């Protein structure tokens, strides 16, 4: 629907500017001239700027000749120090070309956005090639991951090829008939979930970005991917359920919960996600529920939080020492979020925290340790270590209680 | 028969498969052409609004296309209240695309339902959103409603003044926003305020595209509101003699 | 009243619901022109869900009341139905298989007319209505009215054999039921012509839909051996 | 509180009098600002920690309540702090639509 609603008249000012500026007979700007402007030894951003700015005025029908030069040279736009307006206008022109010339534009655009270290890199990514394996479009040069216009382009491509692949393999299984439908549905669900996971991993800050600065290209790409995932979840919430059952790196949970308004449906299946055997899935469920409770503080959210507290208290006395550490290290920062969402949980949260603190203290007492936290019973506050698991878990319990008390007190 | 054809087309709408649904939706205007019976038109548009509320985005856009095409028939709607109420419910959707489609729907329906305050507030709210698709839809709907309504016109005039004066708005959105002012001809004082705004615009935004758009909008406003035509002609002659740009001169000629 | 009964007959709460439906649908119309009538009717329908259901049942009962009123109210029902009247069809099935013992003859004829209209229009869920109406035919009986009803529904099914074709299970249900009717019916020249029509239709279905007739079961052979 | 409850009952009985009742609540808020704001969180039904569902705009009784609250809040500066985000949104809606009733 994005391409169709793009065609919709907004105000008609574009027609006015068409009739006014294009009448200058500056239409001497030709694809060969644009290609020459791109291939200057210096960057020479002025000439390409003027040409593509002029091309914005061109109607979609006559803009077809410029498809080859714009797509072929968009790899050069990844270089450092390219002006933003160049990429913005390229995005606008690509959207226009997509509105009138979708399929071959997609084929040539994917062929153009190859990593380029492999040079040709199998330029035979035909229409069928992408239609069978939509994830090819994600196999692109790393620089697009922090280039918001071309990233938006790639997201459009990815959505289109997911739907195209669905219809394609449906048609293929129909014609090859001469059960398999279950395998079709499973393959489609797996493909959509895999696309979602790759996008989420793109949203992660890399090590260099890890090496504050909340306004950058990464935030723009995160917003774009969040919008696309919102569209996908609206299209099929079962994909959201499958992705969350698969889980993903918990650093994204604030980002994903804040940027995907359809995420509120997660409270429906979180009770069933909790009941999975895998410890990792339960940990992820607790973290997800904590972020949602921060976001949406609803009675159903409170009931699911009560269930979360009860299961954490339950399997506190089912897990071994190593399992206790591995489970309660990530899910303890969720308790402060639960306290923030729901004051009526203070009783159960504090009772659970006391029980786990005494269990961990006894566990510390069983074996000789380095720090011996029990004798350090009168320590002060310490805001922000390869020690043994139990003292780490005790310090984590301490920090959880510190955060809860500090936020409630102020 | 009219009703027979109507329900035989309706069973396609209920088919579930998207192809038959959009087929029926775009089949609707032909049925209006065959049977300009206000009973049938009212019932058909109610069904359209129901499927618009419950259907996905593509089906909503199809219903938008149908509403735009079936402009001549929609003044014969009996239950305008229920129709617009169930249409308006989609505006609360978190999906920005659905909100944009609903804003465009309201803009198409502006002829039969002006002076509807909740619709006006929805237009005003979306105008300051973040999703560019929703903002453009809000601009289109604002154009239509300001063409129809009067109080909405002065409210949007004030909002556009404080928005263009603001720095958050990008240049392209400012270009899209200016021709809204061509509908401020509902009364003399509103037109004069719009004239002051356009004077401010041409003074403080001297680049080619927006002086083009702004002085063309001023020309249309002066044409509609005959009170300010002499000063508009004087301003056009001033821009013709003084401004050096060829494009601005050619627009002055036109 | 509508359903034949006497003083001793129990006050049927379903029939009282139908009477309340009569009250709301008629008193709201007030004999005004259809335009404002359907305007107000749509307003009342869109007010809420139970009143929507009440209006739908009132339209359904009016379809069983009088011919001209049946035409106008079926028009209005097709114009004002929101969900396509699927739960309305469910209530039609319930009223049908429950109250057919007491249904008046004119109401029977008008209900048959409504069934034909629904089948011709291809409204969704009509297969359920067809197979539950089919179920009410009593085997091993020779009452004139029942045989007339069987012939009428047979005529409906024959003219809309394509609608049977797109309804896979209904093919098997119809062919089995008509074979049972064939082994039941004999004796008169009119019944002989009816027999000819039924056997022609059944042979055509069996040849054209042999694969679909596979799931009927061994009792198909049991019907075959008698004919 | 009794005045408001009986006025809402009157709204249910005789909705055509909605404009006059809104005028009533306008004058009630303006002439009794301090006495209203202790009753604000009950009137808006705001929960201590939950986020209440957005009330149905264009409803008669809710508009009546909002008119009373806003006209109470014209003089009092502590009143708007108890408003949720949708209450501000509805304030903007009412202010543009019913400027003669709802003050700044």
């Amino acid at each position: 629907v994005d391409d169709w609603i793009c065609e919709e008249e907004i105000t008609g000012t574009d027609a006015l500017l068409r009739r006014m500026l294009l009448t200058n007979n500056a239409k001497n700007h030709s694809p060969k001239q644009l290609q020459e402007a791109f291939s200057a030894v210096p960057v020479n951003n002025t000439q390409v700027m003027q040409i593509i700015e002029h091309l914005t005025l061109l109607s979609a029908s006559e803009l077809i000749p410029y498809a080859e030069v714009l797509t072929s040279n968009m790899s050069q736009l990844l270089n450092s120090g390219v002006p933003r307006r160049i990429l913005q206008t390229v995005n606008k022109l690509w959207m226009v070309l997509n509105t009138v010339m979708p399929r071959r534009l997609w084929v040539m655009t994917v062929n153009a956005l190859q990593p380029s270290i492999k040079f040709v890199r199998q330029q035979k990514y035909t229409q069928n090639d992408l239609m069978i394996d939509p994830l090819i479009v994600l196999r692109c040069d790393q620089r697009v991951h922090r280039c918001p216009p071309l990233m938006d382009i790639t997201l459009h491509m990815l959505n289109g090829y997911l739907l195209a692949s669905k219809a394609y393999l449906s048609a293929h299984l129909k014609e090859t008939e001469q059960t398999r439908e279950e395998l079709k549905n499973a393959l489609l669900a797996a493909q959509d979930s895999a696309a979602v996971q790759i996008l989420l991993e793109i949203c992660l800050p890399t090590e260099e970005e890890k090496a504050d600065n909340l306004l950058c290209n990464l935030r723009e790409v995160q917003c774009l991917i969040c919008c696309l995932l919102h569209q996908m979840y609206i299209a099929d919430p079962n994909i959201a359920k499958l992705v969350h059952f698969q889980g993903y790196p918990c650093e994204l949970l604030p980002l994903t919960v804040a940027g995907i308004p359809s995420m509120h449906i997660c409270l429906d299946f979180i009770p069933e996600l909790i009941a999975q055997p895998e410890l990792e899935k339960q940990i992820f469920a607790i973290q997800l529920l904590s972020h949602l409770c921060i976001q949406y503080a609803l009675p159903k959210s409170l009931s699911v939080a009560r269930l979360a507290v009860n299961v954490m208290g339950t399997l506190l006395t089912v897990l071994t020492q190593a399992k206790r550490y591995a489970f309660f290290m990530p899910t303890l920062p969720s308790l402060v979020s639960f306290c923030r969402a729901f004051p009526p949980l203070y009783e159960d949260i504090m009772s659970l925290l006391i029980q786990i603190g005494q269990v961990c203290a006894s566990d510390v007492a069983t074996q000789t340790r380095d720090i011996d936290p029990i004798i350090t019973r009168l320590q002060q506050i310490k805001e922000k270590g390869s020690m043994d698991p139990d003292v780490q878990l005790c310090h984590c319990i301490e920090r959880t209680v510190i955060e809860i008390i500090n936020m409630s007190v102020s | 028969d009219a009703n027979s054809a109507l329900m035989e087309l309706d069973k396609g709408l209920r088919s579930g498969k998207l192809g038959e649904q959009c087929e029926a939706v775009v089949r609707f205007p032909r049925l209006f052409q065959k049977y300009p019976f206000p009973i049938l038109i009212n019932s058909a548009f109610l069904k359209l609004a129901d499927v618009f509320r419950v259907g996905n985005n593509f089906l909503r856009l199809c219903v938008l296309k149908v509403t735009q095409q079936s402009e001549k028939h929609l003044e014969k709607i009996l239950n305008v209240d229920e129709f617009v109420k169930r249409i308006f419910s989609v505006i609360h959707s978190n999906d920005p695309v659905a909100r944009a489609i609903t804003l465009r729907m309201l803009g198409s329906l502006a002829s039969i339902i002006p002076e509807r305050k909740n619709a006006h507030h929805s237009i005003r709210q979306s105008l300051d959103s973040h999703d560019n698709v929703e903002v453009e839809a809000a601009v289109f709907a604002a154009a239509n409603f300001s063409a129809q309504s009067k109080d909405f016109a002065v409210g949007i005039c004030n909002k556009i003044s404080e928005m263009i004066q603001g720095l958050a708005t990008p240049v392209d959105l400012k270009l899209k926003l200016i021709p809204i002012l061509q509908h401020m001809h509902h009364d003399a004082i509103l037109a004069s305020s719009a004239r002051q705004l356009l004077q401010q615009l041409v003074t403080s935004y001297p680049s080619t595209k927006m002086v083009i758009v702004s002085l063309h909008t001023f020309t249309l406003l002066a044409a509609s509101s005959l009170v300010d035509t002499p000063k508009q002609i004087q301003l056009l002659l001033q821009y013709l003699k003084n401004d050096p740009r060829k494009a601005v001169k050619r627009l002055a000629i036109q | 009243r509508l359903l034949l009964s006497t003083s001793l007959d129990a006050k049927d709460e379903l029939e009282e619901r139908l009477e309340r439906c009569m009250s709301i649908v008629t008193s709201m119309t007030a004999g005004v022109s259809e335009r404002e009538a359907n305007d107000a009717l749509n307003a009342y329908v869109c007010k809420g869900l139970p009143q929507h259901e009440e209006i739908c049942l009132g339209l359904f009962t009016l379809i069983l009341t009088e011919p001209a009123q049946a035409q106008k109210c079926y028009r209005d029902l097709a114009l004002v139905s929101r969900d396509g009247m699927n739960i309305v069809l469910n209530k039609i099935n319930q009223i049908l298989m429950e109250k057919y013992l007491k249904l008046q003859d004119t109401c029977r004829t008008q209900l048959v007319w409504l069934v034909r209209e629904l089948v011709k229009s291809g409204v969704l869920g009509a297969d359920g209505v067809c197979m539950t109406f089919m179920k009410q035919i009593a085997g091993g009986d020779v009452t004139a009215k029942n045989i007339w009803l069987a012939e009428s529904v047979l005529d409906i099914l024959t003219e809309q054999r394509e609608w049977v074709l797109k309804s896979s299970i209904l093919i098997a249900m119809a062919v089995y039921t008509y074979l049972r009717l064939i082994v039941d019916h004999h004796g008169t020249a009119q019944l002989q012509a009816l027999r000819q029509k039924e056997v022609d239709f059944c042979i055509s279905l069996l040849r054209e839909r042999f694969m679909e007739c596979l799931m009927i079961g061994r009792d198909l052979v049991r019907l075959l051996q008698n004919v | 509180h009794l005045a408001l409850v009986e006025l809402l009952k009157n709204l249910t009985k005789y909705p055509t009098d909605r404009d006059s009742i809104w005028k009533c609540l306008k004058f009630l808020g303006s002439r009794h600002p301090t006495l209203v704001l202790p009753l604000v969180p009950e009137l808006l039904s705001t929960h201590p920690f939950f986020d209440t569902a957005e009330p149905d705009m264009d409803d008669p009784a809710y508009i009546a309540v909002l008119v009373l609250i806003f006209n109470a809040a014209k003089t009092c500066p502590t009143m708007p702090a108890l408003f949720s985000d949708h209450t501000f949104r509805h304030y903007a809606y009412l202010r543009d639509s019913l400027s003669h009733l709802v003050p700044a």
Partner: peptide, 13 residues
């Protein structure tokens, strides 16, 4: 109902 936030108005028919 993923297209509507839980704290949005409910369209009661």
């Amino acid at each position: 109902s993923p297209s509507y936030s839980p704290t949005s108005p409910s369209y009661s028919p």
